[PDB]
Amino acid sequence: PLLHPERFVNLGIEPPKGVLLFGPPGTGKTLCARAVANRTDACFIRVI
Amino acid sequence: KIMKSEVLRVTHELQAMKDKIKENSEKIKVNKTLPYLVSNVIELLDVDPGKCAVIKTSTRQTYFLPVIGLVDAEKLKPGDLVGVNKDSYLILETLPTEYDSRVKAMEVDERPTEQYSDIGGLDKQIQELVEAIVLPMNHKEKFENLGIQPPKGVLMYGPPGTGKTLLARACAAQTKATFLKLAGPQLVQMFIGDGAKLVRDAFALAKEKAPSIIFIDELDAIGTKRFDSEKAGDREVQRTMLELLNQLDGFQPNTQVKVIAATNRVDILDPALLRSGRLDRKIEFPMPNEEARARIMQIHSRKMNVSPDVNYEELARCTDDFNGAQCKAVCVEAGMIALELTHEDYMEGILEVQ
Amino acid sequence: IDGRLKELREQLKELTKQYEKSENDLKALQSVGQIVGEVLKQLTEEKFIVKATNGPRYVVGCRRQLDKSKLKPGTRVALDMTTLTIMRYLPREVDPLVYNMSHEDPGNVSYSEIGGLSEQIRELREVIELPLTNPELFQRVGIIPPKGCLLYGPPGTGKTLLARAVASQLDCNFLKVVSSSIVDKYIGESARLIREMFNYARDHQPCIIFMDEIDAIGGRRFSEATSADREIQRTLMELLNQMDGFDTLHRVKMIMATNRPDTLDPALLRPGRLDRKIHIDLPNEQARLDILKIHAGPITKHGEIDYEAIVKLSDGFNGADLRNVCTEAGMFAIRADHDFVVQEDFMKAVRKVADSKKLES
Ligand SMILES: Nc1ncnc2c1ncn2[C@@H]1O[C@H](COP(=O)(O)OP(=O)(O)OP(=O)(O)O)[C@@H](O)[C@H]1O
Ligand SMILES: Nc1ncnc2c1ncn2[C@@H]1O[C@H](COP(=O)(O)OP(=O)(O)O)[C@@H](O)[C@H]1O
Ligand SMILES: Nc1ncnc2c1ncn2[C@@H]1O[C@H](COP(=O)(O)OP(=O)(O)O)[C@@H](O)[C@H]1O
Structure with a gap:
């Protein structure tokens, strides 16, 4: 969705409505940080 | 005759005194452009030996202006939020009141844009409630000249995903009038009389804003079937x-602001809300058949142009006991994977949820 | 002749002169009014202690026209805003503003809008009104006035409509109280709520308490014997012993609009109990045609007065159903966008409601 290459037409209107990246204490939110680095300057805030 | 001198005095007296109206009005209006004290009307009908007023100022004081010196008490009833002179300690002018914090804008959509065409399957039921609700809005004068006051209480009972919410908002859009949505399950507040106050100001807001659509959801949650037990007996919620x-x-007079209640099972309600003037139009909302489900998902995916010539017949065969929401989820699941494609990217949507 | 338009000019001058006198009273006042306080202490004939509602109290003089007998201690008064002297004394009120009276004496020609069983309406009025009008005679001779009356006909002729209409000769405020709403929790301390509603009736002394549903669904489901055992009956016994709530002094009665009189705790029909019960059932053919006529009263269309044929198809239909019948007839005319309602529309409405109730029953 951040690349916005295909969300509009080929796939339905909007990309999947959400993501729940859960899991036991471990890899959780490291992939979120990696996606944040790989994406644009619109970067995450870690709220508790 | 005397008309020449009469009108010569008439026009002058008219224009000069209306100018005096304007002079008066401006001298109070800039004070009306500077009101400061809330108007807690402890109304005392002191007839001159006509009326009077007691105003609780915002600065914690009491001003007993005589005979309500600027405004009529027909429009000024005992309440609050009416302009009070900051210097003359007098009632200036009415102004909109406060809609009970939550009710100020709980979830009020100013105008819904969803159309009647994108929903369907229950077209007979939707046309019935359109005749019972939307027609009393557009052709309200037809009912007025007929002499029959339209009913207000329409109860849409049926399993979730049958499109009660879309239909209600589409009906409100067709009426082009105000729409107010009530979140029923969260109306159960621990505060004493809180739900009572929320419903009071919700009706007040609907009355103050056009012939509205009061769309109260979860009527089963709101009202129990009086199946009292030792665990609970619906004691407090009976107040709401x-x-x-x-x-x-x-x-009831002027027949505006309709009540639309959405639930799944009508039977969980006692025979008290069901009445001619109360909730009367109980409309079934069944799960759509294979044809209706296929048409509904086709309409939802109409804005999707990826896989040409998909008749959705296998989808209709595989859409056993699914809602309009489930059909929408099925088609947007294809609308998430179609980067399958034709007649086979639809099944997994239902399988994902469980 | 321009002089014949004098009348129109006179109307214009009168119309604006009303606005001009209104504005003259609006600007001539231009007053600051008076601050409101309470008489904290009279002190003496000359100086008085008046406390503002929000702090300071002052040693002020009194209005020349007023006297100390009109001022009194602990009474709301008005002080001059600047000179700080008593200007006028005002009465005060307090309001609980919660669960108060909702329906009042103002009412429609219900006496004529009921139609059916007018004799039954007269009988209930005969039982109720006289102790309600002049209860002092009952104390004067030493007889206890009745408490109220019972009503049958679970879905039939409007019991609530009767409770409204009968108060026409009564000039009282009918109150629609629910038995579940009044008992609340399943404790004997449910008498707190009846005390509040009776106090509300004591504040609005000419008041009839119209009960909604005491024998919860008398036709089926759970009766007084089933489900809540004796909880309803004990709470009714609370209103029973309320009968000493100054029946001579208080213009309060209680109408019990049960569905079915089958399970009503026959211990509550003894003398000193609710006592009187008036029989209301589904309207007969005569009452049915009368209520059809009054329902069609507001409807002015071509149609016909063929009410008996409508009665034949719609026999044993309650007054609310027949009101729904007339509304459905209007719905049929308007769904078809016709400004005419003919007996065929009535036939369609009667057939629709008959089929609907037949399927629902
Ligand atoms: N796949 C991984 N590769 C490298 N380091 C990882 C990985 N998963 C977790 N870690 C390490 O775990 C630590 C915290 O990881 P992460 O930020 O994903 O979790 P968190 O925010 O602390 O919470 P939780 O453990 O509950 O998910 C870091 O030191 C990170 O390097
Ligand atoms: N006839 C219909 N046409 C299009 N979408 C529908 C229809 N019925 C249901 N939906 C879908 O269902 C969702 C509404 O669900 P909901 O209002 O909870 O169902 P219900 O009103 O039966 O409780 C919407 O997001 C909509 O996409
Ligand atoms: N005899 C009647 N005449 C006119 N209207 C009636 C009559 N009986 C019932 N109604 C209508 O029924 C509605 C409610 O009646 P209700 O008091 O619920 O009757 P019941 O308690 O027997 O069900 C009222 O709005 C009233 O207009």
């Missing part, structure tokens, strides 16, 4: 229930 009942009769 009787308030709603007493507020149903407020708009």
Whole structure:
């Protein structure tokens, strides 16, 4: 969705409505940080 | 005759005194452009040996202006939020009141844009409630000249995903009038009389803003079937229930602001909300058949142009006991994977949820 | 002749002169009014202690026209805003503003809008009104006035409509109280709520308490014997012993609009109990045609007065159903966008409601 290459037409209107990246204490939110680095300057805030 | 001198005095007296009206009005209006004190009207009908008023100022004081020196008490009833002179300690002018914090804008959509065409399957039921609700809005004068006051209480009972919410908002859009949505399951507040106050100001807001659509959801949650037990007996929520009942009769004259209640099982309600003037139009909302489900998902995916010539017949065969929401989820699941494609990217949507 | 338009000019001058006198009273006042206080202490004939509602109290003089007998201690008064002297004394009120009276004496020609069983309406009025009008005679001779009356006909002729209409000769405020709403929790301390509603009736002394549903669904489901055991009956016994709530002094009665009189705790029909019960059932053919006529009263269309044929198809239909019948007839005319309602529309409405109730029953 951040690349916005295909969300509009080929796939339905909007990309999947959400993501729940859960899991036991471990890899959780490291992939979120990696996606944040790989994406644009619109970067995450870690709220508790 | 005397008309020449009469009109010569008439026009001058008219224009000069209206100028005096304007002079008066401006001298109070800039004070009306500077009101400061809330108007807690402890109304005392002191007839001159006509009326009077007691105003609780915002600065914690009491001003007993005589005979309500600027405004009529027909429009100024005992309440609050009416302009009070900051210097003359007098009632200036009415102004909109406060809609009970939450009710100020709980979830009020100013105008819904969803159309009647994108929903379907229950077209007979949707046309019935259109005749019972939307027609009393557009052709309200037809009912007025007929002599029959339209009914207000329409109860849409049926399993979730049958499109009660879209239909209600589409009906409100067709009426082009105000739409107010009530989140029923969260109306159960620990505060004493909180739900009573929320329903009171919700009806007040609907009355103040056009012939509205009061769309109260989860009527089963709001009202129990009086199946009292040792665990619970619907003690407090009965207060919220009787308030709603007493507020149903407020708009009987001029027949505006319709009540639309959405639930799944009508039978969980006692035979008290069901009445001619109260909730009367109980409309079934069944799960659509294979044809209706296929048409609904086709309409939802109409804005999707990826896989040409998909008749959705296998989808209709595989859409056993699914809702309009489930059909929408099925088609947007294809609308998430179609980067399958034709007649086979639809099944997994239902399988994902469980 | 321009002089014949004098009348129109006179109307214009009168119309604006009303606005001009209104504005003259609006600007001539231009007053600051008076601050409101309470008489904290009279002190003496000359100086008085008046406390503002929000702090300071002052040693002020009194209005020349007023006297100390009109001022009194602990009474709301008005002080001059600047000179700080008593200007006028005002009465005060307090309001509980919660669960108060909702329906009042103002009412429609219900006496004529009921139609059916007018004799039954007269009988209930005969039982109720006289102790309600002049209860002092009952104390004067030493007889206890009745408490109220019972009503049958679970879905039939409007019991609530009767409770409204009968108060026409009564000039009282009918109150629609629910038995579940009044008992609340399943404890004997439910008498707190009846005390509040009776106090509300004591504040609005000419008041009839119209009960909604005491024998919860008398036709089926759970009766007084089933489900809540004796909880309803004990709470009714609370209103029973309320009968000493100054029946001579208080213009309060209680109408019990049960569905079915089958399970009503026959211990509550003894002398000193609710006592009187008036029989209301589904309207007969005569009452049915009368209520059809009054329902069609507001409807002015071509149609016909063929009410008996409508009665034949719609026999044993309650007054609310027949009101729904007339509304459905209007719905049929308007769904078809016709400004005419003919007996065929009535036939369609009667057939629709008959089929609907037949399927629902
Ligand atoms: N796949 C991984 N590769 C490298 N380091 C990882 C990985 N998963 C977790 N870690 C390490 O775990 C630590 C915290 O990881 P992460 O930020 O994903 O979790 P968190 O925010 O602390 O919470 P939780 O453990 O509950 O998910 C870091 O030191 C990170 O390097
Ligand atoms: N006839 C229909 N046409 C299009 N979408 C529908 C229809 N019925 C249901 N939906 C879908 O269902 C969702 C509404 O669900 P909901 O209002 O909870 O169902 P219900 O009103 O039966 O409780 C919407 O997001 C919509 O996409
Ligand atoms: N005899 C009647 N005449 C006119 N209207 C009636 C009559 N009986 C019932 N109604 C209508 O029924 C509605 C409610 O009646 P209700 O008091 O619920 O009757 P019941 O208690 O027997 O069900 C009222 O709005 C009233 O207009």
